[PDB]
Design a protein around this ligand. Structure first.
Ligand SMILES: CCCCCCCCCCCCCCCCCC(=O)O[C@@H](COC(=O)CCCCCCCCCCCCCCC)COP(=O)(O)OCC[N+](C)(C)C
Ligand SMILES: CCCCCCCCCCCCCCCCCCCC(=O)O[C@H](COC(=O)CCCCCCCCCCCCCC)COP(=O)(O)OCCN
Lengths: 75, 487, 73, 93, 50, 615, 51, 69
């Protein structure tokens, strides 16, 4: 049974139970979708190029450099 | 110059615009409310960009006079701890708007008024350094939650549910107010920076610590007083009930961090075993009570009670890692419990039973809901790889380093967490399908599918890489642990 | 009633007609994203030991025999 | 409004704080409190760096790690006596 | 409740046979001597001081 | 390259689960199995470049928990010990994947099965390659999660649901000890990594303050770690789950019940070798528990009359043997028996599944009789596997059981002699019920029904190649690995396994053998063969059914109900917990007792005080 | 396989009998092969490797 | 058959909204006194004593005198 074509014209079930419209027209986005989608994109970009733009200043890297230049003073 | 003033003004403008909008224009009310909430969320996120996690002192502060002699005044600001709570508060509310989006016609515009009012109200709580006004906004959240529970409650028995949630809060609130009066009359002001630098009397320390504990033991469910949360929490709308365990439950627990631990260094040490002997038996008793439960909402609330009693152990165990783990666990719980109540409320909005007996075999249908529910149960199941486990592992580490006995009882909590949550999952969405009761039912559409996406991504992000959350607040936790003593 | 539910992981007997075409894409999809895992790992796998015999991993790796001392970490 | 480099607050000592009367100069007590943690994090970090020293020593030497890392094992065990706030033996800082 | 009566006997055999291994004292029945290493039982390569 | 060993099964599982509708029931079967086979080839390459080309590989991806001096990282430890288990897990996982595609061709929800299998493969790869306790803990919990998911593969099946739930609770109670162990060892070293504690793990010699009284520190840590390994090795403490775990599909059971999750608890001890040897107290209790569990399982399996149930007790007996091997500082025979076991019990599991699903899905001994001549292939396979199981002289299983029993005899400690006695008397039981399995099936008149025999169909070719590979393995691997890894000081382990100078008894385990004890377990094996053949083939007129008055039916029930553990433990612990969670906590603590302050407690109090105040 | 009064057994395929026989004969030969070369190891008589 | 809601069986409604209010039953009885005095005043006291004893033993090992608490 590794050569016969499948007996399925389309994957069963509807994605989010939303019945596709007649062919040719769009999905008719809902009122909440557009602001929520643009805010999701803004969140993604802010957390992407904002988090990996903040200088690494903390109590960890400052202490790291300080102890790296202070453990070497054993004499 | 994205300061804290705008973060509080924006929800106020959103509420004010909504007040003068006709009820007929239901299209505009929801759109503008959601837009205001999302703008507030982005304005909170941008603060994380300019946080400057280096200084021990406080971040952006706004000072507004409140008394003729500038004795006490509105003094804003975050240090390292309330920042994440502000972000999560600004993030949960748009989810509240989205979950109650379809049925807004019956709710009206008054539904969004209460939510936005509580929104900037809880925003003004976390970033409020002045001690007294912290109490003013700490109990200001009574009215919005009272209204949400009562006006849009599910069943008719909501009348008795709200009374407990109110009066239990008022008792502790006024008990704290007396301590605030004693502190102000003794010291002279209530500004946090000064009041942390005042030599107190040991006999006075114990009484004031008890007075603060009078209310802070009600917000976090303790053994003597935890009846209000289940009764007044099963009987609230899903959009509203998702922040009783979301932000309304983190006031007292976080209030311990800001107004109890550095405030009374010599009293928390003397009262440490009492908190241990309360929370350790709470995590056992509440967890056992959870097993013999039938309502779908109450089990999640009891699991939340157990999680808060667990985080209380790790908070009073003064460790640089204990407090950080407490904050991580509180954020993770705010995510997972919110997700779980949405998951158990989407079932109610379709069938309206709230009984595990009727539910069964929900894997043969609505599989996406089953997958989401399984993921959030695993998150509540305390598995490594999710943000929770990072949460309670540090709690256990901090407790064991101080006391060996308390750690074993606390870990009994995560042992017993597999007895009720997994049983609920296998008894709701993995049983034998029964067509007698659930004749017909749909699956999640595009709204609730997108609702869980931020929850899932934040859960995984803070579970596999919690570095940024710990990176942003190592200075503040270090300053909080080292206080009063000099060794 | 099985056709009504989506069953995101596939239905019970989900047998698409062009399943071979999708499997070819899926296998190609794994390979194309597997290269970044292999490429990013080349800057890793520090093994200070030198094997007694040559292995075939010297072409894409250089983190062996270099991290000898432990006084400048 | 900062330089692109790592910040440096102060290193020598806070002059205002007097141990005999800890609550005498509130302005300088917070400086002492923050200086304590900013100096204890240095010890924590050097403990971490010596931990990685030991870890790479065990990862290089082989079976003879009971006689070629004892000079670092004794430098680790004594560094955990007063590191951070982790065990009831608080360091005498 | 009758099962607990069988439970005591079932584990009793294990511990009872465990005690019997004490009544024979196979420790003193070794046919050889304790193992010895050079250099103070390999003191340098097991710790101590160089 | 080394990241491809671990991440490819996860990637295959994720893509199969997310796009199980884009790929048919065979697309995922040929895709996930191909990815797992590629991972197996990568593991073989790593074994060639590490085990023989002795140079361990080390790495660190990113910091997981970057708190203060609690450095948690995503690094892995590609060590000589680890790569052997890489081979063991990858080869068996790929063979099981090939095995399942034939079995699951009729089971509807096919792609979900390979999705779960690949999740398990990824989790245990993460566990074995791990180098930090907490980062090993995610694999430890993920193995249990995948075990639950796979036993819960049949959501309709009520028995599977209860079995899965009980397995999760008992495994949680088990690894409670290990979970305590991570932070127990952390409070003495202020670190969680492996390379920084195995460097100096003998220095600490202080005590602690536990719940009741002050005890030792290292010994307590090792005790906690062993209690954690109890949950994932079905020891005397909590072994309620494995006997009831075979309520799900068969191909997974060849991978979860007898091949790999078997290795988790023993590999806990094996990985942390230079921690238990410095805690002699923990070693002795480990030996006691291992011997007790091995004997208990060996005498448990004999009465049961099911294919999967009895062999689960054989697996538990091997668990006890391996736990003892890890309890006497003789970890060499532990890993050697692990490698042998993953062959000669996975093979038997595949054979049992092949004969079960080809006989109208029946797994019984009382009902099914003999059909050996109907098909010789998988019976020859299972006969080879059984011969390895008893450890016939000069076979794969002999080279492990013989040496482990000799090591048990040599050590004269109070636990060595007792556990050697227990192992010697358990050899008789294991050789008895193994041949009982060989005899009650395929060597008796057929007692089955007349419809199932007509509907007979042998093992398909794709499911027979894994059996062929396992048969080829567990006939030469024992001879090939006897010299190279247990050879009196073989130089490939390096730091992977460390044995203290004091407790090193290997040379006198071979050159001081009395020759009257080394070859005795073969004598118990042949005696068990004789008695089993006599009872189950000829002398069964009275030796089979005992219709006496008393003390003989109860003897039957005592071992059938496995020492009433499922009865006494249930009623006295979980039934009591469920009773007192409703009649104590919900009665005299919160609801009813202190509720005299909420509704109907003070509400009626102010319906009298406030009333008599207007007048 | 020929059909009877209830047992209409199907004969095993060509490769499900000869493969089994020719693979089991290997193990049967290997038992004696290891009992001859390395056989003298564990018997108590004639210890090999310079003995 | 067009009702998405449950049928709300009569025998299940009482079972549901009976355990929700147990104040009437759990007011005054003999077993309640024993249960409360053995699991709300007894166990918390025992565990508190255990915790303070553990703190005292930790103090003694370090040598510092135990705090009054
Ligand atoms: C320790 C936590 C780690 C992170 C958690 C994720 C680990 C996997 C957890 C999910 C595993 C799958 C469990 C899904 C629920 C099982 C029951 C169920 O609802 O099945 C659904 C869902 O099916 C699935 O199993 C989907 C699996 C999706 C999960 C794939 C992701 C797993 C890998 C991610 C791990 C994280 C990777 C690391 C990230 C950095 C549909 O199955 P059907 O075959 O269609 O049968 C239903 C019957 N009927 C057809 C009639 C409707
Ligand atoms: C189904 C479609 C869903 C689409 C989502 C994406 C699809 C993939 C989903 C899989 C899950 C991925 C989740 C992200 C995992 C990231 C793990 C590593 C993150 C990390 O620690 O590195 C940070 C990267 O910053 C970053 O850029 C991180 C950006 C992550 C954005 C996620 C936005 C979620 C917002 C949720 C808010 C919830 C609030 C709750 C409090 C900075 O690390 P660093 O400091 O070391 O910098 C380095 C300077 N040298």
């Amino acid at each position: 049974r590794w050569a016969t074509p499948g007996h399925e014209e389309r994957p069963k079930g509807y994605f989010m139970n939303r019945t596709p419209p007649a062919p040719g027209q769009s999905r008719k986005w809902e009122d909440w979708e557009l602001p929520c989608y643009i805010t999701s994109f803004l969140t993604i970009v802010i957390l992407g190029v904002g988090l990996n733009a903040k200088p690494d200043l903390s109590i960890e890297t400052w202490a790291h450099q300080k102890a790296l230049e202070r453990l070497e003073m054993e004499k | 110059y994205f300061n804290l003033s705008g973060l509080i003004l924006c929800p106020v403008l959103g509420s004010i615009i909504l007040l003068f909008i006709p009820n007929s224009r239901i299209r505009l009310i929801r759109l503008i409310g959601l837009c205001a909430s999302l703008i507030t969320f982005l304005y909170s996120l941008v603060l994380w960009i300019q946080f400057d996690s280096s200084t021990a002192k406080f971040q952006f502060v706004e000072s507004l006079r409140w008394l003729p002699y500038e004795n006490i005044n509105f003094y804003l600001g975050i240090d390292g701890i309330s920042l994440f709570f502000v972000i999560l508060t600004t993030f949960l509310i748009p989810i509240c708007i989205l979950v109650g989006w379809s049925g807004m016609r019956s709710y009206g515009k008054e539904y969004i008024i209460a939510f936005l009012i509580c929104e900037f109200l809880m925003i003004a709580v976390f970033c409020m350094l002045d001690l007294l006004l912290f109490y003013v906004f700490f109990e200001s959240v009574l009215i919005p939650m009272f209204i949400i529970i009562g006006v849009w409650g599910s069943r008719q028995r909501k009348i008795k549910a709200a009374y407990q949630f109110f009066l239990y809060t008022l008792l502790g609130s006024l008990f704290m107010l007396l301590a605030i009066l004693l502190i102000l009359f003794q010291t002279g002001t209530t500004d946090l920076q000064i009041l942390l630098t005042t030599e107190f009397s040991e006999r006075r320390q114990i009484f004031l610590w008890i007075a603060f504990f009078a209310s802070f033991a009600v917000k976090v469910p303790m053994v003597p007083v935890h009846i209000w949360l289940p009764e007044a929490h099963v009987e609230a709308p899903t959009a509203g009930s998702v922040i009783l365990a979301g932000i309304l439950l983190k006031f007292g627990t976080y209030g311990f961090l800001r107004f109890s631990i550095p405030m009374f260094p010599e009293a928390t040490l003397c009262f440490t075993p009492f908190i241990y002997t309360l929370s350790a038996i709470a995590i056992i008793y509440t967890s056992l009570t959870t097993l013999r439960q039938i309502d779908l909402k109450k089990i999640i609330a009891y699991s939340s009670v157990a999680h808060m009693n667990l985080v209380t152990i790790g908070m009073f165990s003064l460790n640089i890692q204990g407090i950080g783990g407490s904050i991580l666990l509180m954020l993770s719980h705010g995510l997972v419990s919110s997700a779980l109540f949405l998951c158990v409320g989407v079932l109610y909005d379709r069938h309206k039973t709230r009984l595990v007996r009727y539910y069964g075999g929900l894997v043969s249908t609505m599989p996406n809901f089953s997958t989401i529910f399984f993921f959030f149960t695993l998150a509540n199941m305390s598995l490594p790889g999710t943000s929770s486990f990072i949460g309670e592992f540090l709690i256990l580490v901090g407790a064991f380093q101080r006391n060996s006995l308390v750690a074993t009882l606390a870990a009994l909590g995560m042992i017993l967490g597999a007895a009720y949550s997994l049983w609920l999952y296998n008894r709701v969405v993995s049983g034998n399908l029964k067509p007698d009761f659930l004749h017909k039912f749909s699956d999640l559409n595009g709204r609730e599918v997108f609702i869980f996406i931020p929850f899932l991504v934040g859960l995984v992000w803070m579970g596999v890489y919690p570095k940024v959350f710990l990176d942003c607040m190592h200075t503040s936790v270090s300053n909080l642990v080292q206080h009063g003593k000099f060794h | 009633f099985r056709a009504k539910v989506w069953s995101m992981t596939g239905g019970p007997n989900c047998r698409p007609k062009h399943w071979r075409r999708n499997t070819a894409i899926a296998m190609f999809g794994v390979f194309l994203v597997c290269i970044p895992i292999a490429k990013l790992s080349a800057k890793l796998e520090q093994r200070p030991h030198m094997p007694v015999r040559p292995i075939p991993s010297q072409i894409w790796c250089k983190n062996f025999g270099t991290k000898d001392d432990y006084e400048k970490e | 409004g900062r330089k692109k480099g790592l910040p440096e607050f102060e290193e020598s000592a806070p002059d205002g704080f007097d141990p005999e009367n800890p609550y005498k100069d509130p302005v300088a007590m917070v400086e002492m409190r923050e200086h304590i943690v900013r100096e204890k994090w240095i010890q924590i970090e050097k403990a971490k760096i010596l931990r990685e020293k030991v870890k790479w020593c065990y990862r290089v030497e082989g079976v003879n790690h009971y006689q070629k890392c004892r000079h670092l094992v004794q430098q680790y065990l004594d560094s955990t006596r007063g590191v951070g706030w982790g065990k009831d033996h608080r360091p005498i800082s | 409740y009758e099962a607990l009566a069988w439970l005591s006997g079932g584990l009793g055999f294990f511990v009872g046979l465990g005690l019997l291994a004490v009544l024979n004292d196979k420790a003193s029945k070794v046919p050889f001597t304790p193992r010895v290493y050079p250099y103070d039982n390999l003191r340098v390569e097991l710790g101590g001081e160089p | 390259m080394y990241l491809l060993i671990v991440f490819l099964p996860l990637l295959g599982s994720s893509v199969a689960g997310f796009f199980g509708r884009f790929l048919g029931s065979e697309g995922s079967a040929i895709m996930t199995t191909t990815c797992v086979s590629f991972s197996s080839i990568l593991s073989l390459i790593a074994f060639y470049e590490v085990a023989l080309g002795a140079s361990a590989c080390y790495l660190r991806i990113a910091p997981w928990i970057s708190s203060e001096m609690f450095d948690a990282s995503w690094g892995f430890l590609f060590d000589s010990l680890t790569v052997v288990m890489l081979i063991v897990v990858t080869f068996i996982s790929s063979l099981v994947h090939l095995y399942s595609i034939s079995y699951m061709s009729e089971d509807p929800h096919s792609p979900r099965f390979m999705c779960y299998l690949s999740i398990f493969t990824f989790f245990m790869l993460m566990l074995v390659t791990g180098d930090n306790f907490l980062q090993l803990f995610l694999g430890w919990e993920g193995v249990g999660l995948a075990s639950y998911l796979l036993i819960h593969f049949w959501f309709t099946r009520l028995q599977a649901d209860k079995a899965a739930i009980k397995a999760m609770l008992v495994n949680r109670v088990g690894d409670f000890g290990l979970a305590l162990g991570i932070l127990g060892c952390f409070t003495l070293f202020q670190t969680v990594d492996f390379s920084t504690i195995f460097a100096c793990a003998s220095v600490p010699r202080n005590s602690w303050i536990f719940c009741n009284m002050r005890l030792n520190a290292i010994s307590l840590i090792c005790i906690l770690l062993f209690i954690g390994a109890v949950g994932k090795s079905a020891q005397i403490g909590l072994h309620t789950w494995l006997p009831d775990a075979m309520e799900g599909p068969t191909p997974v059971s060849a991978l979860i019940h007898a091949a790999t999750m078997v290795t988790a608890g023993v590999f806990m001890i094996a990985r942390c070798s230079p921690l238990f040897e410095y805690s002699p107290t923990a070693l002795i209790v480990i030996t006691f528990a291992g011997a007790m569990t091995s004997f208990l399982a060996a005498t448990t399996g004999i009465l049961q009359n099911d294919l999967k149930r009895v062999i689960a007790y054989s697996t538990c007996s091997q668990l006890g043997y391996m736990i003892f091997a890890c309890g006497i500082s003789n970890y060499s025979v532990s890993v050697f028996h692990l490698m042998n076991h993953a062959f000669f019990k996975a093979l038997l599991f595949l054979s049992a599944g092949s004969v079960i699903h080809a006989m109208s899905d029946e797994q019984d001994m009382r009902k099914m009789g003999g059909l050996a001549s109907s098909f010789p292939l998988t019976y020859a396979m299972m006969l080879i596997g059984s011969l390895s199981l008893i450890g016939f002289p000069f076979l794969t299983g002999f080279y492990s059981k013989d040496v482990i029993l000799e090591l048990a005899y040599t050590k004269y400690t109070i636990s060595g002699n007792f556990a050697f006695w227990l192992g010697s008397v358990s050899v008789l039981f294991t050789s008895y019920y193994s041949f009982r399995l060989l005899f009650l099936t395929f060597l008796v008149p057929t007692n089955s029904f007349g419809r199932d025999i007509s509907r007979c169909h042998d093992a398909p070719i794709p499911m027979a190649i894994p059996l062929i590979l396992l048969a080829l393995g567990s006939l030469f691997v024992g001879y090939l690995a006897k010299d190279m890894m247990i050879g009196l000081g073989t130089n490939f382990w390096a730091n992977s396994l460390l044995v203290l100078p004091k407790n090193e008894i290997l040379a006198e385990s071979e050159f001081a053998a009395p020759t009257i004890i080394k070859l005795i377990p073969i004598l118990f094996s042949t005696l068990g063969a004789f008695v089993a053949y006599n009872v189950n083939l000829v002398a069964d007129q009275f030796q089979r059914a005992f219709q006496t008055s008393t003390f003989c039916n109860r003897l039957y029930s005592f071992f059938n109900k496995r020492w009433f553990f499922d009865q006494v433990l249930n009623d006295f612990l979980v039934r009591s917990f469920l009773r007192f969670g409703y009649e104590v906590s919900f009665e005299a603590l919160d609801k009813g007792a202190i509720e005299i302050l909420g509704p109907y407690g003070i509400s009626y109090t102010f319906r009298r005080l406030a009333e008599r105040i207007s007048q | 396989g020929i059909t009877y009064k209830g047992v209409t057994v199907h004969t095993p395929k060509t490769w499900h009998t000869v493969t089994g026989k020719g693979l089991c004969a290997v193990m049967w030969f290997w038992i004696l092969y290891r009992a001859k070369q390395d056989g003298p190891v564990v018997m108590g008589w004639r210890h090999p490797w310079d003995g | 058959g067009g009702g998405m809601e449950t049928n709300k069986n009569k025998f299940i409604e009482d079972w549901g909204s009976a355990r929700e209010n147990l104040e009437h039953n759990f007011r005054w009885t003999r077993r309640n006194f024993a249960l409360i005095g053995i699991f709300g005043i007894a166990l918390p006291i025992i565990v508190y004593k255990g915790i303070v004893k553990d703190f005292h033993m930790q103090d003694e090992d370090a040598g510092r005198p135990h705090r009054k608490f």
